[PDB]
Design an enzyme around this catalytic site. Sequence first.
Site, PDB file in Angstrom:
ATOM      1  N   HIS A  61       0.839  -1.209   0.000  1.00 52.72           N
ATOM      2  CA  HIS A  61       0.000   0.000   0.000  1.00 52.72           C
ATOM      3  C   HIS A  61       0.872   1.256   0.000  1.00 52.72           C
ATOM      4  O   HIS A  61       0.454   2.310  -0.465  1.00 52.72           O
ATOM      5  CB  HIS A  61      -0.917   0.011   1.225  1.00 52.72           C
ATOM      6  N   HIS A  91       5.821   6.925   6.366  1.00 54.06           N
ATOM      7  CA  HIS A  91       5.534   6.526   5.012  1.00 54.06           C
ATOM      8  C   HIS A  91       5.019   7.731   4.253  1.00 54.06           C
ATOM      9  O   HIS A  91       4.797   8.797   4.835  1.00 54.06           O
ATOM     10  CB  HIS A  91       4.475   5.425   4.988  1.00 54.06           C
ATOM     11  N   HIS A  93       2.304   9.117   0.824  1.00 52.00           N
ATOM     12  CA  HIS A  93       1.259   8.945  -0.167  1.00 52.00           C
ATOM     13  C   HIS A  93       1.627   9.851  -1.327  1.00 52.00           C
ATOM     14  O   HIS A  93       2.084  10.975  -1.124  1.00 52.00           O
ATOM     15  CB  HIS A  93      -0.094   9.372   0.403  1.00 52.00           C
ATOM     16  N   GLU A 103      -3.067  13.642   0.758  1.00 48.32           N
ATOM     17  CA  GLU A 103      -4.331  13.249   1.358  1.00 48.32           C
ATOM     18  C   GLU A 103      -5.066  14.471   1.888  1.00 48.32           C
ATOM     19  O   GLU A 103      -6.185  14.756   1.461  1.00 48.32           O
ATOM     20  CB  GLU A 103      -4.054  12.220   2.444  1.00 48.32           C
ATOM     21  N   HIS A 116       3.772  11.024   6.335  1.00 51.27           N
ATOM     22  CA  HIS A 116       3.164  10.744   7.613  1.00 51.27           C
ATOM     23  C   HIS A 116       4.163  10.107   8.552  1.00 51.27           C
ATOM     24  O   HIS A 116       4.639   9.004   8.296  1.00 51.27           O
ATOM     25  CB  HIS A 116       1.986   9.795   7.455  1.00 51.27           C
ATOM     26  N   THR A 195      -5.821   6.808   7.768  1.00 48.33           N
ATOM     27  CA  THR A 195      -6.389   6.991   6.421  1.00 48.33           C
ATOM     28  C   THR A 195      -6.361   5.726   5.590  1.00 48.33           C
ATOM     29  O   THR A 195      -6.749   5.752   4.426  1.00 48.33           O
ATOM     30  CB  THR A 195      -5.689   8.092   5.671  1.00 48.33           C
ATOM     31  N   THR A 196      -5.909   4.616   6.189  1.00 51.85           N
ATOM     32  CA  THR A 196      -6.028   3.297   5.582  1.00 51.85           C
ATOM     33  C   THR A 196      -6.775   2.401   6.556  1.00 51.85           C
ATOM     34  O   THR A 196      -6.769   2.637   7.756  1.00 51.85           O
ATOM     35  CB  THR A 196      -4.657   2.672   5.308  1.00 51.85           C
TER      36      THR A 196
END
EC number: 4.2.1.1
Length: 257
Positions: A61, A91, A93, A103, A116, A195-196
């Site tokens: 992911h 990590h 995004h 995000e 993040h 958010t996951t």
Amino acid sequence: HFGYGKHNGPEHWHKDFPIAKGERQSPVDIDTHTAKYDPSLKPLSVSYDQATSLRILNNGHAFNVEFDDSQDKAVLKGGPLDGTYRLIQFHFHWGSLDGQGSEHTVDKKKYAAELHLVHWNTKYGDFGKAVQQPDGLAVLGIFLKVGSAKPGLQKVVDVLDSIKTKGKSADFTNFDPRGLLPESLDYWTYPGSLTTPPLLECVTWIVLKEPISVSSEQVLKFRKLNFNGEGEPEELMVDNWRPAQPLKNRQIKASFK
Ligand SMILES: [Zn+2]
């Protein structure tokens, strides 16, 4: 589990994780004119001088850089927080194009990527217990814009070839996360969620106002990663971001005017 594709992406998540339609979901759009300056908010205290990175992992992911969180070595305190939160991983995004990937948004503006840094409240003893609590996690969010290179990111970019596919990991020691921070620590803060999946509502979000700049070549290398495992059909790891969710009954507070 879940994904970001047409048939398993964020619009489908509520079927397996009904909290997806909850009251304190993230990310959100930060409307800078309605955010409330709060003079009670303290400066953030980021103590990362003793950080011990261990490993970098493609989890299917995103990629996570993991830290030793068995002692108070890299901690976040102050700001809107009570107590001490330990860094466990960071990590990113990112998007398929430079015009999307973050995000959170700021007055509907998207950035190329979002970093993040995930921390957990030491009063709960471990990360697994902390995610079950409303004040369990603090996530520092940092926007990336494309421009000049960020020298402190390059060690991460260079190792990505070794973790191209899902489940691959590599030793990643002596990385200093201080090299990813902007000059100013002014921030917005609000109560939200992971958010996951499992999308738990356990996060105090701290989103920094100042973006960091990375180069086009740096972010291009993120886009060469794969969602898939080795030997499976190649699907590029891009657009691994969840869209903004309704603010509902929440106020965003700012540490600055
Ligand atoms: Zn994230």
